[PDB]
Enzyme design. Structure first.
Site, PDB file in Angstrom:
ATOM      1  N   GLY A   1      26.859  51.822 130.567  1.00  0.00           N
ATOM      2  CA  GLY A   1      26.561  51.982 129.140  1.00  0.00           C
ATOM      3  C   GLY A   1      27.641  52.656 128.284  1.00  0.00           C
ATOM      4  O   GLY A   1      27.403  52.932 127.097  1.00  0.00           O
ATOM      5  N   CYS A   2      28.825  52.920 128.839  1.00  0.00           N
ATOM      6  CA  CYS A   2      29.864  53.659 128.103  1.00  0.00           C
ATOM      7  C   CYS A   2      30.958  52.800 127.439  1.00  0.00           C
ATOM      8  O   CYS A   2      31.918  53.343 126.862  1.00  0.00           O
ATOM      9  CB  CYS A   2      30.480  54.656 129.053  1.00  0.00           C
ATOM     10  SG  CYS A   2      29.211  55.681 129.726  1.00  0.00           S
ATOM     11  N   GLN A   3      30.797  51.472 127.519  1.00  0.00           N
ATOM     12  CA  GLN A   3      31.798  50.509 127.064  1.00  0.00           C
ATOM     13  C   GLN A   3      33.193  50.882 127.556  1.00  0.00           C
ATOM     14  O   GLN A   3      34.203  50.586 126.930  1.00  0.00           O
ATOM     15  CB  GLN A   3      31.741  50.381 125.546  1.00  0.00           C
ATOM     16  CG  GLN A   3      30.784  49.255 125.062  1.00  0.00           C
ATOM     17  CD  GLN A   3      29.815  49.705 123.975  1.00  0.00           C
ATOM     18  OE1 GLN A   3      30.040  50.717 123.312  1.00  0.00           O
ATOM     19  NE2 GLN A   3      28.717  48.959 123.801  1.00  0.00           N
TER      20      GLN A   3
END
Length: 138
Positions: free
Chosen positions: A50-52
């Site tokens: 989810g942290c790109q």
């Protein structure tokens, strides 16, 4: 983490920052001071979603009952946000982590309001991931 400010000092220092330019640099500098992750710990089991960006965090409970966090990210701002989270949780037990409300801390640091939605989501992902891990311990 010994090298880095304890959470009370970290918060104080953020409150003395004159602007986002200064806070952002502080965040970058903090990330640069994290210990190098063992290459063996850059494994799918330690990958954070989810942290790109590429992010790894490994949590281990030491024989004293204290949680030790290590990690890395290929984005400098993410790695500094990771350092902030690590500081917040430094010297805590698993139970400490589960029960620690990070919100008033991040609110006083006043970071999230300057972050892009991508970096804000990524900060939240890291914190969710660590709490979930901490929660699985005896």
């Amino acid at each position: 983490m010994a090298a880095l400010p304890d959470k009370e000092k970290l918060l104080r220092n953020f409150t003395r920052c004159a602007n986002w330019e200064e806070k952002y640099l502080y965040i970058i500098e903090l990330g640069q001071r994290l210990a190098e992750l063992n290459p063996q710990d850059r494994n799918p089991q330690n990958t954070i979603h989810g942290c790109q960006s590429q992010v790894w965090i490994v949590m281990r409970r030491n024989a004293n009952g204290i949680i030790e966090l290590q990690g890395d990210s290929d984005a400098a701002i993410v790695k500094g946000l990771m350092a902030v989270v690590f500081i917040l949780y430094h010297q805590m037990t698993a139970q400490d982590i589960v029960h620690f409300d990070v919100r008033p801390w991040f609110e006083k640091m006043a970071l999230a309001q300057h972050l892009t939605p991508s970096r804000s989501q990524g900060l939240e992902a890291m914190i969710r991931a660590i709490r979930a891990k901490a929660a699985t311990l005896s």
